[PDB]
């Protein structure tokens, strides 16, 4: 006798999904939507290479720690990679004021061009070439941060300095300087004749007056003295004015901000892999079409959305048996 | 299932039908064979494709990432920053895991609904002219050749016929 | 529909019935007319009114607004502040858009369920005494005047009657 | 209900059956009694137990607490800290209240689906051999003793029997 | 033959809703729940008018920039409106310490009454009426911030000041003062005889000592000098003690905090519309019963919940065909 | 005639649940999942007792306010309880620098052992036993913070101090010190002969130089002088170097950080209840298996998730009538 039956599909699929009322439910078809795979490398981001500081910190790079010469004139970058605890930081011990705010600024910058703003030859009445230290060695011999100059007395005199610089460029200008804190009055007079010193710095916005602090400190990198550095952004058409009768670590090079854009500073021990990606994380790059990944929260580029799940699978087909 | 059809009054699936999700198995004087219902298979395809796309698109503007540095005397704001990034991370993680669980369940019961709706499309056509076998099958009170079966499949079955 | 009734085995809606969502169309010796089922129309009204209210009320304590100023050397906390307000904004936006999508779907399938439940309220009353036309209609095996129709509508239909 | 069974075509619940959620009431020549269907009662028990557990477990990594102190010239970050902790508090509160409302509704309609699926498990077994009373009951066209009732209950009912 | 049919409603509605499985679904009835409309005006908030700073900043208002005389004695406000970049700010260039913290405090305040705390006539041994500048013009002639006084030497002497004020009011008191940073020793001695100066300020909680910073700065509003201002809240029954031998910009007027309440500072270019509302945003007011709006995140009053959606429509009725 | 019926359970349950489409819906079975009950006590957390500062603040405790002697050598704690406004804080008025940052540090610490770092007997050329005050009474007679020493001149001379301390311990060391701000030059010379004083402090990381501020202040606890305190964490193997010619409030006792772990500071007026719990809040402890509670946001231990709801009840059974 004639008959017709109504039924549904079935196959050999072992793929499971979860529901609110039932776990591990085998279905005919499913769709994974969670990327779980990365190349374990640091790549170019859309063809543009990241700036991989090696054993150098951002401070070491910008101030010009002699061990960081590799980064003297760095090309455009997509993002910046810094180790958790770079070995080449402040060779002469001290501190960098508002360092975290500067590093934050860096995350919006893609390119500097370093320019010389005050030539070493322009220090007529001081010694501009005796400011070096064994804390900052270069090729076996004492040296110093390359982008600023440690000025000292000449002929047992330190005339008060009145030097100024007008930013005639179209770009914002990152200007760095510092002050040296000796350990005693003897070191004070020996380096800079004057016993009672100051550094004043002014711009449209800045109204600063620093005086050295003498104190007995523990040796770091063989030194009990400290260098304290400062920075500002000089607006185009504005000028910066320095006055000082000692302890001045004067600018030599500054940084034209010549490309702003989205960027970041990644903390990672990885080195440059020779690859290209559209999406980078501190532990590797992602090539995916998934809407989700679970690789790392910190991400740059065109990326999937990060999530803490180790499994996300959607059901497309029906229950299988 | 929620609708009683899949793994219910239809005890098992057809390893034999590979043309679609829902379909027919006919048995008459011209022989046997499987036949997928395109109208209901395609509709179910549009539905879960829209479902997948609606999930992907609703979560495109999620929570982002950016690293921030803090010094040693900024532990409070460092902790605030960590707690708020972990916060959004947790609610978006919950939001994705919960969404999948919920929709996966609607999707299974969606298929169960489509099959049951197919069985009744046929049942409401073959009124007096057939008897419910109770297992997803219909025994005919007449001869249904290959042209007649097609009239059931494409919804143009003609009731003007005797049956006894 | 999910329940097979609306735009299913009942192919279309009645432009003619304006007294409610679900109802009847009778055809007998005293004439024709439409009649809305108040019991099921009102229940469906209470349901979606509660649904709307439950949506409005669950999202009264959302995320607020307040502006905050930061100077030029507070970019990190300014960025933190922006990122967290944008954060809550995104999850509440997702929460409202997703909620609407989900409930809208439950609401359509709710109406589809009510109609199917109405068709079966009648079907389980007119047991032997009528035949399923297969299109949402019931042909009577007797005479059902305007008082008898009302007995079907208000659920007091009397089966003690012959039918052949 | 959404499936028409509970407080629908089965007008009321049985205060008499205490062995399960869903069951049978038989009436024959050997007497009367209630009998719970273990197969469908247990399945429903597994389901809502998984439901409860899935709710508890999806919300184990929520938002935490920690108190933080701020001085008098840190009102902006104090307010940021308050606003973000109140923020997560609100979305998690909404997330729990909304989840309960939604699942409670699925759970009621889950029971309504199980009963309807039980009524049809029987209906699709007693084909010709019984008539639908329209109120959740089936009148037999023969004698169904206590062994025969069991055949209906455990799904082994034998259709090879006359009926008139 | 007699028959009865079961069916559903239908009408001429073209209103659509979306579902997870289907977009643009025409239904019989629907309910919009997203307000998308605003009056584009700044209104009173429940009858109480906002404080509309015009081209004045909060600093210009509170310090009493001569161009901001309109706000000399301001009535109760519901909220405060300030332009993105007010033209009348610090007429004499400089800076306002903890300005953002003070603006934040302002958001919890609905009313000041300004009182005179130190009369100009009480400056027996200094010039209290010669402290004016072309940076602060008023009606063509030089002037200064009205609520503080720029004291200078009298008969080539500047006696050290010991002035104090007990807050005998029931209200917290907002007290403002400042220090002048000249550009050189010559300007120093010419304004205030004494070459080496300080300002000390104390309360129960405050222990401050300021010394002027001499430096060469770029001209802003025609001045290379700077005024640096400070504030504190004087608790009732507490006293503030000033001591100074020069460069002191002394209080004259202070602000009694006479109404605390929920308020805000809106950044907006809009001016006062002559309307009233229950809900205000920086781009206009909202009159609505919707549970959601998409107008602006920053809101004050009894408002709907903000959301990024440009469409939220609930289904009430069934599918239409 | 024989028949069989299909039906559902029913009972005498009056328990209701809510749905999106219906409130107050009576069902057969339900499950409460919201804890609403606490013991109203402060308990041990897993057997380990909290540190209940009584009328003492964290400053009073650590500096050693004489009224806080109860806490001179405190045992391991699970958490710390401090009143909203402790009576025994800084007995001699002044301020504690970076107090909130220190309190935050405290939340990661479970145990100190206080050690003597500079013995009082080691002050050969100063008075180490005359630095007491009526602001800091102990048993009717004048006293001072126990963990630091207020050094004064001996034989009308105050030789400049050069004292240093190497942290030879395995633990980080919390070191406290301070500076006294007198009210005039007379008080200055009378306490410490030298009129012009400073305190310099250095470590690997710290480069500090403090000078006293003389000013006329209101009396707090009967004093117009101020003590200003500082702290640092001394790393193991690092040294701290002090130099001073007056106003130095020297370290005597420091704190070995001998147990780090998760902890908190609870603001609560409650005292120690003699109970034990796994979950504590500032208003009472929680014993529960619920996944949610609504007792207090601020929580420590193995706790349910806080929520603002005053009712959360899940449906398990079906509709009851
Ligand atoms: C589901 O399957 C996985 C994969 O084998 C298994 O490890 C796990 O135990 C199962 N989960 C549950 C809860 O049944
Ligand atoms: C060093 O300076 C002194 C005085 O400033 C001067 O007399 C002498 O000529 C100088 N010697 C050199 C080496 O220039
Ligand atoms: C910098 O130089 C330009 C042109 O030489 C001048 O117009 C401008 O005012 C200068 N900037 C300052 C602040 O001196
Ligand atoms: C839905 O309708 C809108 C306008 O009413 C239209 O812009 C859009 O293309 C439609 N969406 C889809 C998915 O076709
Ligand atoms: C201010 O004067 C009041 C009342 O005369 C007095 O009691 C109070 O101590 C004074 N305030 C201060 C801190 O000097
Ligand atoms: C449900 O019951 C509560 C508590 O008895 C009652 O106050 C209220 O009328 C009901 N709640 C709602 C929202 O209808
Ligand atoms: C502290 O003392 C140890 C040996 O006792 C020494 O090796 C270490 O370098 C010292 N630290 C400093 C900073 O003096």
From TrEMBL, chains A, E, F:
Compartment(s): Host apical cell membrane; Virion membrane
Superkingdom is Viruses
Carbohydrate-modified residues are: 24, 155, 166
Which residues form each disulfide bond in the chain? 43-275, 56-68, 91-136, 279-303
Q: Name one GO biological process term.
A: virion attachment to host cell
Summarize what the UniProt record says about post-translational modification: Palmitoylated.
Q: Which GO terms describe its cellular component?
A: host cell plasma membrane; membrane; viral envelope; virion membrane
Give membrane topology per the record. Single-pass type I membrane protein
A molecular function (GO) held by this record is: host cell surface receptor binding
Q: Which UniProt keywords apply?
A: Clathrin- and caveolin-independent endocytosis of virus by host, Clathrin-mediated endocytosis of virus by host, Coiled coil, Disulfide bond, Fusion of virus membrane with host endosomal membrane, Fusion of virus membrane with host membrane, Glycoprotein, Hemagglutinin, Host cell membrane, Host membrane, Host-virus interaction, Lipoprotein, Membrane, Palmitate, Signal, Transmembrane, Transmembrane helix, Viral attachment to host cell, Viral envelope protein, Viral penetration into host cytoplasm, Virion, Virus endocytosis by host, Virus entry into host cell
**What interactions and quaternary structure are annotated?**
Homotrimer of disulfide-linked HA1-HA2.
Q: Which family does it belong to?
A: Belongs to the influenza viruses hemagglutinin family.
Summarizing the function annotation, the protein's role is:
Binds to sialic acid-containing receptors on the cell surface, bringing about the attachment of the virus particle to the cell. This attachment induces virion internalization either through clathrin-dependent endocytosis or through clathrin- and caveolin-independent pathway. Plays a major role in the determination of host range restriction and virulence. Class I viral fusion protein. Responsible for penetration of the virus into the cell cytoplasm by mediating the fusion of the membrane of the endocytosed virus particle with the endosomal membrane. Binds to sialic acid-containing receptors on the cell surface, bringing about the attachment of the virus particle to the cell. This attachment induces virion internalization of about two third of the virus particles through clathrin-dependent endocytosis and about one third through a clathrin- and caveolin-independent pathway. Plays a major role in the determination of host range restriction and virulence. Class I viral fusion protein.
**Protein name in UniProt:** Hemagglutinin
Shown part of the complete sequence: 16 to 336 of 568
UniProtKB/TrEMBL annotation, chains B, C, D:
Official protein name in the record: Hemagglutinin
Protein's organism: Influenza A virus (A/chicken/Guangdong/174/04(H5N1))
> What role is this protein assigned?
Binds to sialic acid-containing receptors on the cell surface, bringing about the attachment of the virus particle to the cell. This attachment induces virion internalization either through clathrin-dependent endocytosis or through clathrin- and caveolin-independent pathway. Plays a major role in the determination of host range restriction and virulence. Class I viral fusion protein. Responsible for penetration of the virus into the cell cytoplasm by mediating the fusion of the membrane of the endocytosed virus particle with the endosomal membrane. Binds to sialic acid-containing receptors on the cell surface, bringing about the attachment of the virus particle to the cell. This attachment induces virion internalization of about two third of the virus particles through clathrin-dependent endocytosis and about one third through a clathrin- and caveolin-independent pathway. Plays a major role in the determination of host range restriction and virulence. Class I viral fusion protein.
Q: What GO terms fall under cellular component here?
A: host cell plasma membrane; membrane; viral envelope; virion membrane
Post-translational modification remark: In natural infection, inactive HA is matured into HA1 and HA2 outside the cell by one or more trypsin-like, arginine-specific endoprotease secreted by the bronchial epithelial cells. One identified protease that may be involved in this process is secreted in lungs by club cells. Palmitoylated.
Keyword presence, Coiled coil: yes
> Which UniProt keywords are given for this protein, alphabetically ordered?
Clathrin- and caveolin-independent endocytosis of virus by host, Clathrin-mediated endocytosis of virus by host, Coiled coil, Disulfide bond, Fusion of virus membrane with host endosomal membrane, Fusion of virus membrane with host membrane, Glycoprotein, Hemagglutinin, Host cell membrane, Host membrane, Host-virus interaction, Lipoprotein, Membrane, Palmitate, Signal, Transmembrane, Transmembrane helix, Viral attachment to host cell, Viral envelope protein, Viral penetration into host cytoplasm, Virion, Virus endocytosis by host, Virus entry into host cell
A single Gene Ontology biological process assigned to it is: fusion of virus membrane with host endosome membrane
Subunit relationships: Homotrimer of disulfide-linked HA1-HA2.
Intrachain S-S bonds: 144-148
KW Coiled coil (keyword) present: yes
What family name appears in the similarity comment? Belongs to the influenza viruses hemagglutinin family.
Where found? Answer: Host apical cell membrane; Virion membrane
Note the coiled coil stretches, chain numbering.
56-90
Q: Which GO terms describe its molecular function?
A: host cell surface receptor binding
């Amino acid at each position: 006798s004639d008959q017709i039956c109504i039924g549904y599909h079935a196959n050999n699929s072992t793929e499971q999904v979860d529901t609110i009322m039932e776990k591990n439910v085998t279905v005919t078809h499913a769709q994974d939507i969670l990327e779980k795979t990365h190349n374990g490398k640091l790549c170019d981001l859309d063809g543009v290479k990241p700036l991989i500081l090696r054993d150098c910190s951002v401070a070491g790079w910008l101030l010009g720690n002699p061990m960081c010469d590799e980064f003297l004139n760095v090309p455009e970058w997509s993002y910046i990679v810094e180790k958790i605890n770079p070995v080449n930081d402040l060779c002469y011990p001290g501190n960098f004021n508002d360092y975290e705010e500067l590093k934050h600024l860096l995350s919006r910058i893609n390119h500097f061009e370093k320019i010389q703003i005050i030539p070493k030859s322009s220090w007529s009445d001081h010694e501009a070439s005796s400011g070096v230290s064994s804390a900052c060695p270069y090729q076996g011999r004492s040296s110093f941060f390359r982008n600023v100059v440690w000025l000292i007395k000449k002929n047992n005199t330190y005339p008060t300095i009145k030097r100024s610089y007008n930013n005639t460029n179209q770009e914002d200008l990152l200007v760095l300087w510092g002050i040296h804190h000796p350990n005693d009055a003897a070191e004070q007079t020996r380096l800079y004749q004057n016993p009672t010193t100051y550094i004043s710095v002014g711009t449209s916005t800045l109204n600063q007056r620093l005086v050295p602090k003498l104190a007995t400190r523990s040796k770091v990198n063989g030194q009990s003295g400290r260098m304290e550095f400062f920075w500002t952004i000089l607006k185009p058409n504005d000028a910066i004015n320095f006055e000082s009768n000692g302890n001045f670590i004067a600018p030599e090079n500054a940084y034209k901000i010549v490309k702003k854009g989205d960027s970041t500073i990644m903390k990672s021990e990885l080195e440059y892999g020779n690859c290209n990606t559209k999406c980078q994380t501190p532990i590797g790059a992602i090539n995916s079409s998934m809407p989700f990944h679970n690789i790392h929260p910190l991400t740059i580029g065109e990326c999937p959305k990060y999530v803490k799940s180790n499994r996300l699978v959607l059901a497309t087909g029906l229950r299988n048996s | 299932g929620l609708f009683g059809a899949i793994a219910g009054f239809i005890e098992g699936g057809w390893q034999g039908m590979v043309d679609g999700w829902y379909g027919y198995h006919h048995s008459n004087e011209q022989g046997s064979g499987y036949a997928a219902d395109k109208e209901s298979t395609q509709k179910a395809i549009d539905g879960v494709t829209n479902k997948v796309n609606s999930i992907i698109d609703k979560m495109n503007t999620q929570f982002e990432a950016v690293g921030r540095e803090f010094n040693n005397l900024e532990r409070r704001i460092e902790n605030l920053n960590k707690k708020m990034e972990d916060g959004f991370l947790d609610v978006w993680t919950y939001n994705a895991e919960l969404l999948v669980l919920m929709e996966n369940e609607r999707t299974l019961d969606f298929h169960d609904s489509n099959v049951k709706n197919l069985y009744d499309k046929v049942r409401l056509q073959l009124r007096d002219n057939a008897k419910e076998l109770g297992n997803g099958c219909f025994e005919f009170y007449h001869r249904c050749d290959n042209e007649c079966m097609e009239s059931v499949r494409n919804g143009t079955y003609d009731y003007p016929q005797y049956s006894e």
